[PDB]
Design a binder for this molecule. Structure first.
Ligand SMILES: OC[C@H]1O[C@@H](O[C@H]2[C@H](O)[C@@H](O)[C@H](O)O[C@@H]2CO)[C@H](O)[C@@H](O)[C@@H]1O
Lengths: 685, 135
């Protein structure tokens, strides 16, 4: 009777996906026919302008096939929160929901404002989950006193903020974004005593913001004699490069009571030991240290990763994740659940294409139907067993554990707990010592941390490598898309940051290409689906496509200056294929629009943004990666290229003035090609 | 001047910009930025309410002064307003705040404020703003 699944995989109905597949097949056939024609009927003799063109066309066709193949089976997922609540979170009985540990990464209070981190912590502490099943760990890599004081003040304010949000069920539960919303705040409100409570909470939040501003102003000036705690002892993290490890717990079982007399979710501030001359691997090492500390202290079976600028928009995100994680039939084979990345305050026109709805609505949706979405960093819920490197169950040893994990016996013993948690009779005074021991700088030596288990080390973005290594073992990942976004963040304000992060992503991809974990041969003969491997190769070798694109972008200008066209003399037998190919491209774009709801604006923005990326940032990233393997400026090439095209256009009309009868025809084709190129290059430049 | 008696200490203490109450209280910029004093929110709320009441009082004064009485303007003291005729009025000078004008809410002094109106008589040129500046 109680066998209904907690979630359902809904196949896209056979009214939009089937025309989409038929149009893809037609476009494949027409691409083959057009390329067969292009191989034949060469341009007049002794013209090297045609071989490069057909080579670029061949590469473009191969790249399009490789990109379009992992889009054949898009599926959606629908969750039953009521069934999960009835099965596990029953009224009048202790909750049987699995514990969750939420990691929050921060590095620099000066670059990252403490108010944003405080709002993230407040939103996390007010999640719609049992307080005994929620733990929060904040990793501050800078070992800054300002972060510690801000966390203490944030806990003090949460002591009164959490009961209000829990009682009145406000959304979002971040005070900064809740109190700065133009939406009518008196909608669907029943409680008679809501207005005065809301006014008092608003005033208290304003006072808390004033206190945080005062703390930041105090911490702005670095004292000559060094930072001193309120207790009077010197701050241990006086030197960022040579500070030891510190762990502090603010709220928890004995941290105190809120305004209603209940308990609050446990909050831990950890800072791993830093010593000169030792590598730390930045966020990957921070995540590994967080995992070890959480295993020592709470040992939660599931870990939710978050940055400082991402706050929990939907308070039921944890329940949505557990709908997949805690399913008896499905949860055994699930490694992580990934949520789409949504950003607030994005420009309505979205010049930078910060929304990136195509990747999160078409690429990831298609990936979910094969083996699951790719890991993208923030807003992901990981299983401990998958993180530890264990293989998923098949569908029909002290020395080894010490070598794989480390020399900490407590951590190894905790890894063997099937239901999580910490064993009884463990003294907290000893648990803190063990957590300090496992957070030491020289712990991950002769171990598999960062190479085979946990966050995989490297100079890469690192969120693709970990997910790919998990998938190579046969694990399945889940893409969850709630109606209300689970987490929301802040998009970059200036184009410089967007260009820098695109360059970073492309550099990480090209680094993955020349590495052992490259999808072409790594994991051969394993439990990775062939279509998933195709998609991984697609998302790995993409910036290489920049090299032909630039060449093709150079093709019109020379074609205008040399006064010869790339194609041979125009023919009806060829023009039919040209026009039909263009119409097929338009039709497949329309259908990809209609089955996903992306929109013509965002689709065209994504196309022109792929062009600008390939010519601007992908080119520089490929050059830098090739230089590294063998051994702003990012806006300089394409602008020049654009200018060159513009110059060529002027030259073109000049030849018309000379040649009279030859003003129409071939020159019109050249102008059409140049207009196509410049209209692709229209954004920015 | 009566409203400044309480407005000046607030702006001087909290260093608000701009110090004109109309433009300070009608700004969409976050007013809690670079604020350290713990007792700033309640003081700002009280100052906003006091400014609203002051604006109401000014509106009432303007509404009263809109209608010109038949017998002429009369001071609150009861004596007739000397500037009853704009073209034929003598010169008047009044000092509101200064050394002996009173104390603000903090017990300090306030900048001296003088209201002057130069004598006007029929048939004599006054040169408008240049003459006003010279006087
Ligand atoms: O967006 C987060 C995620 O992006 C990854 O690059 C994406 C890119 O964002 C998207 O616009 C494009 O269509 O696909 C690439 C595929 O790599 C990036 O590699 C990740 O590190 C990052 O977390």
């Amino acid at each position: 009777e109680a066998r209904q699944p907690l979630s359902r995989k809904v196949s896209i109905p056979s009214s939009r996906i089937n025309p989409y597949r038929m149009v893809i097949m037609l476009r494949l056939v027409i691409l083959c026919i057009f390329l067969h024609y292009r191989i034949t009927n060469p341009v007049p003799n002794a013209y090297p302008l045609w071989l490069v063109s057909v080579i670029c066309e061949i590469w473009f066709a191969i790249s399009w096939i490789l990109d379009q193949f992992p889009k054949w089976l898009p599926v959606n997922r629908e969750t039953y929160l009521d069934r999960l609540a009835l099965r596990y979170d029953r009224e009048g009985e202790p909750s049987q929901l699995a514990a969750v540990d939420i990691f929050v990464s921060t590095v620099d209070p000066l670059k990252e404002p403490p108010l944003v981190t405080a709002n993230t912590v407040l939103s996390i502490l007010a999640v719609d989950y049992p307080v005994d099943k929620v733990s929060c760990y904040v990793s501050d890599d800078g070992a800054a006193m300002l972060t510690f004081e801000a966390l203490a003040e944030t806990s003090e304010f949460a002591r009164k903020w959490v009961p209000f949000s829990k009682k009145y069920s406000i959304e979002p539960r971040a005070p900064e974004w809740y109190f700065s919303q133009k939406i009518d705040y008196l909608k669907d409100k029943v409680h008679p005593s809501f207005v005065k409570d809301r006014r008092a909470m608003k005033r208290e939040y304003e006072e808390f913001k004033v206190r945080i501003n005062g703390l930041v102003s105090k911490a702005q000036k670095v004292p000559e004699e060094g930072w001193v705690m309120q207790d009077g002892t010197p701050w241990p993290g006086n030197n960022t490069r040579d500070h030891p490890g510190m762990i502090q717990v603010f709220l928890g079982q004995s941290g105190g009571l809120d305004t209603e007399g209940n308990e609050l979710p446990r909050l831990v501030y950890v800072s791993r030991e830093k010593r000169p001359g030792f590598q730390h691997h930045k966020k990957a090492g921070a995540m590994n240290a967080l995992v070890r500390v959480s295993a020592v202290l709470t040992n939660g079976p599931f870990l939710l990763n978050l940055d400082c600028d991402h706050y929990i928009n939907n308070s039921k995100a944890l329940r949505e994740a557990m709908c997949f994680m805690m399913d008896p039939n499905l949860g055994k084979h699930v490694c992580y659940v990934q949520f789409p990345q949504r950003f607030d305050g994005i420009d309505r026109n979205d010049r930078y294409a910060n929304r990136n709805t195509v990747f999160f609505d078409i690429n990831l949706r298609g990936l979910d139907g094969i083996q699951g979405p790719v890991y993208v960093g923030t807003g992901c819920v990981f299983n401990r067993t998958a993180l530890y490197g264990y293989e998923p169950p098949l569908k029909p040893s002290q020395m080894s554990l010490e070598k794989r994990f480390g020399q900490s016996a407590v951590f190894v013993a905790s890894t063997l707990m099937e239901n999580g948690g910490v064993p009884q009779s463990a003294t907290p005074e000893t648990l803190l010592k063990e957590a300090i021991h496992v957070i030491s700088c020289g712990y991950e030596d002769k171990t598999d941390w960062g190479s085979e288990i946990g966050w995989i080390y490297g100079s890469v973005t690192e969120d693709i490598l970990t997910g790919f290594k998990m998938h190579a073992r046969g694990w399945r990942s889940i893409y969850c898309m709630p109606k209300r976004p689970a987490f929301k963040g802040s998009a970059p304000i200036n184009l410089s940051d967007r260009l820098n992060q695109v360059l970073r992503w492309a550099l990480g991809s090209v680094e993955i290409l020349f590495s052992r974990h490259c999808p072409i041969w790594y994991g051969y003969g394993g439990r990775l689906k062939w279509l998933e491997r195709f998609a991984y190769v697609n998302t790995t070798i993409y910036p290489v496509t920049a090299i032909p694109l630039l060449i093709y972008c150079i093709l019109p200008a020379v074609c205008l200056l040399t006064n010869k066209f790339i194609i041979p003399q125009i023919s009806n037998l060829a023009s039919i294929w040209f026009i039909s190919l263009f119409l097929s491209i338009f039709a497949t774009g329309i259908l990809e629009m209609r089955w996903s709801g992306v929109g013509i604006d965002e689709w065209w923005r994504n196309e022109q943004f792929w062009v600008i990326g390939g010519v601007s940032a992908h080119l520089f990233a490929v050059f830098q990666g090739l230089l590294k393997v063998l051994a702003t400026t990012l806006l300089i090439p394409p602008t020049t290229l654009l200018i060159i095209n513009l110059v060529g256009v002027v030259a073109g009309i000049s030849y018309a003035i000379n040649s009279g009868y030859q003003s129409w025809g071939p020159l019109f084709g050249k102008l059409f090609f140049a207009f196509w190129v410049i209209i692709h290059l229209y954004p920015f430049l």
